[PDB]
Design a protein around this ligand. Structure first.
Ligand SMILES: O=c1cc(-c2ccc(O)cc2)oc2cc(O)cc(O)c12
Ligand SMILES: O=c1cc(-c2ccc(O)cc2)oc2cc(O)cc(O)c12
Lengths: 335, 328
């Protein structure tokens, strides 16, 4: 009887709380860059290409990108013509021989557990399994309840579906456990059907929430390994906060595999945050990217980067539509 | 021969770097407040007075004020006539039973070393390296400080320039800049012997060593030397309110006619609800010292309690303010 409403917009915008919550990564990247990696003293000598800086810092491409993007977003580095240089603000205040340096003050955090953890991550690049997966899934679910109403509101209907025998569409939600985004879409589109594809420990949460939102009869839950197990037939495939967990080659692989099974007129829906096109900001996404770098194999990506993978899978890019909490729905179509 | 200039303004303003650097205290205060102290679930029951909240959270007065000030500055609590309440933003997203709660996401940081340290600090409430670390802020701010310090009256101690006594503080850089601006003045740095070694070096570099004396002592119990002006720069925020009142009284007690007490510090607004940059810095001070950031009204309370006359408040840089008071 009672039905949880997944379409009502939240009464306030939670986004500033997420932005404040990332503040530690500003402190940690500052302390890592001043006191451990010598970034500012190195670049003060001369601007360097990204490849040159990678080499001089002895860091992976990914580690160098997230470091450079973070410091650019804090207005401390600048990107020319490819080269990376200090801004006057960094040159005057974060170079050790500047009379106005405050590097010693920043270095008061050099040995904090957070700074050391981030340095180790950069350089190296009591709960059981069920409780741990539930705890993490329910923690990310709070963001989904805030964003899924927007997401469902801005998702276009698309073509009549080709899987159900005018037909609704089948929406497959890959590694989007909680499945909340799909449940909102199914409340908006009563003729559609949804499929959540994820690990079994996560599907338990989806089963509960599908009952609460009253879409259980139009939702299937499939356990599977997204890299190797076949995706079920679907009109639309959603990758929501998935691709930023993965490094570049894995992103291209996942986009290709999802695309391979789409019918003509099927859609790949990428829902994620966006760095700007030269990976210099904005600040709140650059700090969130450091969190993703610390916890996963990926980072935040730009629209241009997503469009590279889309184009490599021979999909047609359609549109980019903001949701909330810095999310963007990138729509592409199988041709 | 060579003379280090202490009067040229820096070409850029370092202040935003300090603000970015305090970001960990935003994360830690959110995770402490959601996951350990249940601040929002408690206040959702009913607005509470500061004293009521201090009892419910089982915190000291000082811990409760740095917590409440931080959350007000993040637009999560509000003060309105003396009670503390949630804002809609907090009620909607930081109360656990709200359907739009993100409390579980914030709690992903609940067991970080930084969060746990702040919780322990809240609930429980070398010098060469440290002095040389704070010296960089002073090199940025001292030019502006010297620029805005008024010359005042002819001094009473030299028999005329004024004698500026710089109590604690550290490097003595602010006094060196004043001595470059006013060649007839003299300065005294009062601090621990280890700190005075740094002042001695910097006094040679800035060419004021001959007009600068280095006095070692304990500021609470040893006699201050005679001075026209006494500077407390980034000192009072290290101390709780009774110790602030004590130190202001002791400094005031030896001022002559025309003497001045110079307080150089950051300022919270008058109802201790912000601004955010100072509220996060206040959490750092709470974590490392016995004090917190204070408001102008709080400083004026101590000034008036010592029978000084409040004169003016002049911004310097890195959020500093020079609060100028006169012996009457
Ligand atoms: O895919 C994600 C995985 C995690 C994560 C978070 C904490 C852990 O101990 C392990 C993994 O956090 C996230 C946080 C986000 O805001 C977004 C994500 O996609 C993820
Ligand atoms: O009086 C101060 C003491 C300290 C401090 C800093 C680090 C420690 O391990 C111990 C004390 O930091 C500060 C930082 C400031 O920005 C301002 C201060 O007055 C202080």
């Amino acid at each position: 009887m009672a039905v949880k409403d997944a379409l009502r917009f939240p009464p306030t915008d939670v986004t500033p709380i997420f932005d404040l919550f990332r503040g530690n990564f500003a402190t940690e990247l500052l302390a890592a860059s001043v006191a451990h990696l010598h970034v500012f003293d190195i670049l003060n000598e001369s601007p360097l290409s990204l490849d040159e800086l990678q080499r001089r810092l002895v860091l992976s491409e990914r580690a160098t990108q997230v470091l450079v993007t973070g410091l650019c977003a804090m207005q401390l580095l600048t990107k020319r013509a490819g080269e990376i240089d200090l801004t006057p603000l960094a040159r005057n205040h974060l170079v050790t021989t500047s009379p106005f340096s405050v590097g010693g003050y920043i270095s008061l955090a050099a040995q904090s557990a957070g700074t050391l953890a981030l340095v180790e991550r950069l350089k190296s690049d009591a709960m059981d399994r069920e409780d741990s997966a539930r705890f993490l899934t329910l923690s990310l679910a709070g963001r989904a309840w805030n964003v899924a109403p927007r997401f469902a509101d801005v998702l276009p209907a698309g073509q009549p579906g080709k899987i159900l025998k005018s037909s609704g569409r089948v929406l497959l939600d890959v590694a989007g456990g909680s499945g909340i985004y799909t449940m909102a879409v199914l409340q908006k589109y009563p003729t559609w059907r949804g499929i959540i594809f994820d690990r079994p420990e996560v599907l338990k949460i989806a089963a509960e929430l599908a009952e609460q939102t009253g879409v259980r009869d139009r939702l299937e839950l499939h356990a599977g390994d997204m890299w190797v197990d076949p995706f079920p037939p679907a009109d639309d495939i959603l990758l929501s906060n998935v691709l930023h967990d993965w490094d570049r080659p894995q992103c291209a692989r996942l986009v290709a595999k999802a695309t391979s099974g789409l019918p003509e007129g099927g859609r790949l829906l990428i829902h994620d945050v966006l760095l700007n096109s030269d990976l210099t900001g904005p600040l709140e996404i650059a700090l969130y990217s450091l969190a993703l770098f610390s916890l996963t194999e990926g980072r935040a990506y730009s629209l241009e980067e997503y469009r590279g993978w889309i184009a490599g899978a021979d999909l047609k890019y359609v549109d980019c539509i903001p949701t909330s909490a810095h999310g963007h729905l990138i729509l592409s179509e199988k041709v």
